[PDB]
Amino acid sequence: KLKLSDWFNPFKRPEVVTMTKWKAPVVWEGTYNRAVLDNYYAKQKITVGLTVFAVGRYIEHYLEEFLTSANKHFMVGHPVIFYIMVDDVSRMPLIELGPLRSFKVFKIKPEKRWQDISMMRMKTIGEHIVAHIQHEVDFLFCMDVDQVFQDKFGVETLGESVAQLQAWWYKADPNDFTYERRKESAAYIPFGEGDFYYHAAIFGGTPTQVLNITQECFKGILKDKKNDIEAQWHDESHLNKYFLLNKPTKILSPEYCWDYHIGLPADIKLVKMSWQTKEYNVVRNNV
Amino acid sequence: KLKLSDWFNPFKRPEVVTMTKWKAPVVWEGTYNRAVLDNYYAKQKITVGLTVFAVGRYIEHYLEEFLTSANKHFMVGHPVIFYIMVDDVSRMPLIELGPLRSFKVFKIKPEKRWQDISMMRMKTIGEHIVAHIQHEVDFLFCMDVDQVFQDKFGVETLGESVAQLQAWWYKADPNDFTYERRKESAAYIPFGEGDFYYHAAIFGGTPTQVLNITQECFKGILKDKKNDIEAQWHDESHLNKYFLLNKPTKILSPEYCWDYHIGLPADIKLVKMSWQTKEYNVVRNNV
Numbered sequence: 380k381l382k383l384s385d386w387f388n389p390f391k392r393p394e395v396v397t398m399t400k401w402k403a404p405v406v407w408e409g410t411y412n413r414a415v416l417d418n419y420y421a422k423q424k425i426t427v428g429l430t431v432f433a434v435g436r437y438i439e440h441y442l443e444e445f446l447t448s449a450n451k452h453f454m455v456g457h458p459v460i461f462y463i464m465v466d467d468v469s470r471m472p473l474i475e476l477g478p479l480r481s482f483k484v485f486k487i488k489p490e491k492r493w494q495d496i497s498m499m500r501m502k503t504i505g506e507h508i509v510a511h512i513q514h515e516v517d518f519l520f521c522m523d524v525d526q527v528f529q530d531k532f533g534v535e536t537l538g539e540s541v542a543q544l545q546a547w548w549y550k551a552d553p554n555d556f557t558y559e560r561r562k563e564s565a566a567y568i569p570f571g572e573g574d575f576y577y578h579a580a581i582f583g584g585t586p587t588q589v590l591n592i593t594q595e596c597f598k599g600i601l602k603d604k605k606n607d608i609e610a611q612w613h614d615e616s617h618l619n620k621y622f623l624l625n626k627p628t629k630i631l632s633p634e635y636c637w638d639y640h641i642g643l644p645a646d647i648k649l650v651k652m653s654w655q656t657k658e659y660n661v662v663r664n665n666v
Numbered sequence: 667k668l669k670l671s672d673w674f675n676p677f678k679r680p681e682v683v684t685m686t687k688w689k690a691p692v693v694w695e696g697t698y699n700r701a702v703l704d705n706y707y708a709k710q711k712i713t714v715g716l717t718v719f720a721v722g723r724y725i726e727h728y729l730e731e732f733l734t735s736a737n738k739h740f741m742v743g744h745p746v747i748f749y750i751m752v753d754d755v756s757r758m759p760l761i762e763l764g765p766l767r768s769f770k771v772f773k774i775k776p777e778k779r780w781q782d783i784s785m786m787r788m789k790t791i792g793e794h795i796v797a798h799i800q801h802e803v804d805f806l807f808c809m810d811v812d813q814v815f816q817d818k819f820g821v822e823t824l825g826e827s828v829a830q831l832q833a834w835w836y837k838a839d840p841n842d843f844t845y846e847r848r849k850e851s852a853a854y855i856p857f858g859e860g861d862f863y864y865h866a867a868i869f870g871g872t873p874t875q876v877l878n879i880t881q882e883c884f885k886g887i888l889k890d891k892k893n894d895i896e897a898q899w900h901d902e903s904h905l906n907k908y909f910l911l912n913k914p915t916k917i918l919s920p921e922y923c924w925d926y927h928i929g930l931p932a933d934i935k936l937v938k939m940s941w942q943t944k945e946y947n948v949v950r951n952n953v
């Protein structure tokens with residue numbers, strides 16, 4: 380049976396947070412033994428899933444670059460299935476995939492508001508988990524399209540529920556976090572509460588856990604609509620509320636989702652994924 | 667460890683050939699216990715691959731219908747990867763896939779002659795086996811595109827090396843078979859020799875065996891080119907020469923690849939796959 384000490388050494392990164400108060404590891408470059416994990420997971424013959432949405436001009440701007448980088452960097456050495464959700468399949472870039480990669484594409488309805496496009500992902504992911512993903516993979520990541528894999532994003536990131544530290548807020552105090560602060564929203568987190576600010580651009584876990592994550596987030600999204608309120612950062616606000624109540628069993632350092640606009644400080648040793656520059660004037664059609 | 671008698675009962679179909687002189691089964695409807703095999707293979711967690719080529723007009727004519735039917739009928743209940751080779755990826759019909767199905771597409775060079783398009787498949791399949799397929803699947807089938815799955819085509823068809831009985835010739839005397847009969851060809855089979863006439867539209871096996879099948883067939887194809895000769899039925903002539911020398915460990919009945927132009931006689935109990943009607947005048951560009 381895989382124990383934390385088998386693969387995780389926090390002492391390799393003494394100047395950062397490596398363990399939570401609930402004993403979940405925060406995975407930083409230097410702390411993980413990928414060789415040990417690759418061997419362990421290869422013997423289990425795991426398959427890892429990855430969902431990605433591209434609706435509207437997000438397709439032309441980001442989808443090819445995401446998928447090309449995912450092919451190269453995501454869980455290399457293990458079977459991987461990319462689940463691609465687009466509103467227009469005729470604009471799907473059909474890139475060549477390498478060994479142990481395969482994919483499938485689904486046509487989805489485009490929501491009128493970009494905010495609803497972002498939030499509806501929670502409903503859609505859950506539907507696909509029930510319909511097929513639960514039978515296909517051992518672990519699933521759900522990711523934003525507006526980012527690019529830069530280096531190996533491997534089995535060290537796998538767990539029962541996996542959260543991502545948002546690049547801008549990882550050193551901040553909880554009372555500075557951009558949680559939803561209105562008690563009328565289901566995403567509400569009071570001042571004096573909170574562990575971390577999680578980025579909604581990457582989350583994952585077992586199909587069972589991701590199903591619960593997305594189900595509970597979407598319930599909150601629906602409740603808010605009935606109360607004529609919309610959380611400040613939409614699905615991300617709801618995701619943060621979820622992970623407050625249901626603590627992630629693993630957290631990823633900002634190295635796994637880094638914004639180069641910040642620069643590259645000492646803490647960020649090897650970037651695995653980077654944000655694309657925002658292009659809202661083109662890719663979004665409403666305020 | 668799986669034994670033939672665990673799943674195969676020849677006495678269920680007494681009026682047809684069910685066993686070869688080398689003790690390989692000929693799989694007919696009624697002889698196989700799919701429930702036993704589905705359990706056996708699910709516990710082994712197998713993945714089955716399927717290669718299919720569509721070049722030129724074959725894409726629009728046959729590819730969608732092939733894939734839609736394969737999605738529905740091929741190895742249901744088990745992970746499947748469709749490997750699609752086309753000369754124009756922009757013409758690839760991106761159908762919706764069901765649970766445990768995924769795919770990837772490759773751009774290939776279109777050969778000038780339809781005969782070479784058919785024959786070059788042997789080279790290309792081998793390259794892909796070494797490159798990736800050997801790492802991705804336990805068994806692989808290689809199929810023509812100009813045919814449609816009609817019913818369950820499942821784990822009862824899997825084996826070390828798998829051959830298909832050609833629908834028109836299965837009752838024929840070997841010396842009436844359309845083997846290549848010129849001794850100058852690598853595919854030459856003398857009168858007085860031959861077991862069955864095998865259809866090049868379906869063959870399969872383990873990646874190791876399929877690699878040998880395709881490598882040896884392509885070596886025969888290249889040798890013939892150096893000797894200024896082309897086998898009468900091209901890759902099929904070479905496939906028949908291969909299976910004469912290296913007996914298949916399993917044969918599929920004409921039920922697994924039936925031409926309805928013959929009609930539907932008593933022997934054909936449940937069609938799993940049917941030929942598309944030939945449209946050479948439209949789909950081919952040279953004599």
Ligand SMILES: O=c1ccn([C@@H]2O[C@H](COP(=O)(O)OP(=O)(O)O)[C@@H](O)[C@H]2O)c(=O)[nH]1
Pocket residue numbers: 431432433434435437493494496497522523524525580657662663
């Ligand atoms: O019009 C849209 C809005 C959102 N998205 C998807 O939802 C994700 C989250 O939205 P976005 O990345 O724009 O939010 P941000 O990270 O910029 O706050 C995107 O990466 C896309 O995958 C999309 O495809 N089309």
Ligand SMILES: O=c1ccn([C@@H]2O[C@H](COP(=O)(O)OP(=O)(O)O)[C@@H](O)[C@H]2O)c(=O)[nH]1
Pocket residue numbers: 718719720721722724780781783784809810811812867944949950
């Ligand atoms: O111009 C061509 C010729 C052949 N093929 C592929 O090669 C296979 C064998 O050719 P064909 O089916 O026409 O031979 P037949 O079964 O009719 O004798 C086809 O099913 C296709 O997959 C193709 O894609 N384009």
Ligand SMILES: O=[N+]([O-])c1ccc(O[C@@H]2O[C@H](CO)[C@H](O)[C@H](O)[C@H]2O)cc1
Pocket residue numbers: 545547557578579612615
């Ligand atoms: O301090 N900044 O100038 C700043 C703040 C936040 C930034 O990223 C955005 O953060 C919000 C939540 O606070 C969302 O995660 C959003 O997706 C990010 O773009 C960048 C700079």
Ligand SMILES: O=[N+]([O-])c1ccc(O[C@@H]2O[C@H](CO)[C@H](O)[C@H](O)[C@H]2O)cc1
Pocket residue numbers: 832834844865866899902
């Ligand atoms: O006698 N016929 O009318 C007749 C009808 C269909 C036939 O099928 C043909 O057989 C060939 C080998 O002989 C190839 O397998 C070819 O792909 C197939 O179309 C062959 C003969």
Ligand SMILES: [Mn+2]
Pocket residue numbers: 523524525580
């Ligand atoms: Mn984003």
Ligand SMILES: [Mn+2]
Pocket residue numbers: 810811812867
């Ligand atoms: Mn054919």
